[PDB]
Amino acid sequence: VRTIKVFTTVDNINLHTQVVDMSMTYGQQFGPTYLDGADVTKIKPHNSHEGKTFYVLPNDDTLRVEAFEYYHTTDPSFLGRYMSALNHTKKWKYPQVNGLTSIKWADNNSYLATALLTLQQIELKFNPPALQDAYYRARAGEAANFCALILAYCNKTVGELGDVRETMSYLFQHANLDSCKRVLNVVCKTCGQQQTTLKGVEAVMYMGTLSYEQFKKGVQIPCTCGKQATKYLVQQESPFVMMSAPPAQYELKHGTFTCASEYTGNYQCGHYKHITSKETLYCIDGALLTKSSEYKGPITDVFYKENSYTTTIKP
């Protein structure tokens, strides 16, 4: 009976010594098994594998705790989805564009490129150690593990189309936004005033207009009475806000926003680009970069800096 020593893991930190039989596949011994993203379930141990670390699924009590502490999930297939994505994302390219880690276009990944570029321009800390560790690497330029985690957390495979707003929502749900607060007032002439307080992810996201200034002045929304009510921002305590709307031609004015996402085409058959407002307006499209003093395009998400805002509307 021939054996080698290998290590299994769910977090690539805590290792578990295994003595594996070289006459059996990894799958027969560990269940689904991966070597830096490559699926070795159906393969028998090679000599060169001695001492190497393999990912497995969290299919024992110790691994379940380690996986939950590191990723903050107990989705049974999470690790397989993360490894499957990593096998691809480790071959993607991550060029530095205007001082930020971008992603060379591949596998319909423009939504991930613009999400990744956005994260590097807003104040956000992640909760799962897996995202903390991988995001730090991504800022340094090695974003393969971060991108594979985004895919896994969002239940998207490599190649699958994704929506930036939805992706950001998932990332924000795995971020510490408990210091974020939003107070809204909704005023109908018939029905009166209704104040609502939003916290965390709902405090920094709004769907219906791209303009933070208009949100402060008031936006018209349906009232149940059939008239239009006015919704406006009473109070904001967030380091950023994200304003989203169905893509429409929209002018981005230098110095009035942090960054934005543009979507050209019809739904599920278009492409994202990223616009960042620095010394001028830079348009980052994966590896590609252009500049302009003005910008108009089909914008769908805009990010703004914030600290503390209180309205002056005396209603």
Interface segment toward Na ion; rule CB under 5 A; list 37-45, 76-84, 118-126, 186-194: 118-126
Choices 101-109, 125-133, 238-246, 302-310; region in contact with Cl ion by CB under 5 A: 125-133
Q: How many CB atoms within 10 Å of residue 295?
A: 20
Query: Of residues 150-169, which lie at the interface with Na ion (CB under 5 A)?
Result: none
Residues 159-198 that bind Zn ion (CB under 5 A): 188, 190-191
Stretch that binds Zn ion, among 93-101, 224-232, 238-246, 294-302 (CB under 5 A): 224-232
CB closer to Zn ion, 196 vs 308: 196
Contacts with 16 (C-beta within 8 Å, 6 or more apart), sequence order? 7, 8, 9, 62, 63
**Ranges within 237-266 binding Na ion (CB under 5 A):** none
Q: Which residues pair with 125 in a beta bridge?
A: none
Q: Residue 188 Cβ, how far from Zn ion at the closest point, in Å?
A: 3
Where in 144-183 is the site for Cl ion (CB under 5 A)?
Answer: 174
Q: Do the bridges between strand 205-207 and strand 192-199 make them parallel or antiparallel, or are there none, so unpaired?
A: unpaired
When binding is defined by CB under 5 A, the residue of 13, 24, 65, 225 that contacts Zn ion is 225
The site partner of 72 among Na ion, Cl ion, Zn ion, none (C-beta below 5 to 8 Å per kind) is Cl ion
Q: Which is nearer to Zn ion, 43 or 223 (CB)?
A: 223
Residues 68-107 that bind Cl ion (CB under 5 A): 72
Sheet strands (E) in the chain? 3-9, 16-21, 33-35, 38-39, 53-56, 96-97, 100-101, 181-188, 192-199, 205-207, 219-222, 228-237, 240-252, 259-266, 269-277, 281-285, 288-292, 295-305, 308-310
Q: Give the closest residue to 302 by CA, choosing from 221, 180, 219, 206.
A: 206
Q: Which is nearer to Cl ion, 136 or 267 (CB)?
A: 136
The C-alpha atoms of residue 188 and residue 79 are separated, in whole angstroms, by: 49
- Binding residues for Cl ion (CB under 5 A): 72, 125-128, 132, 135, 174
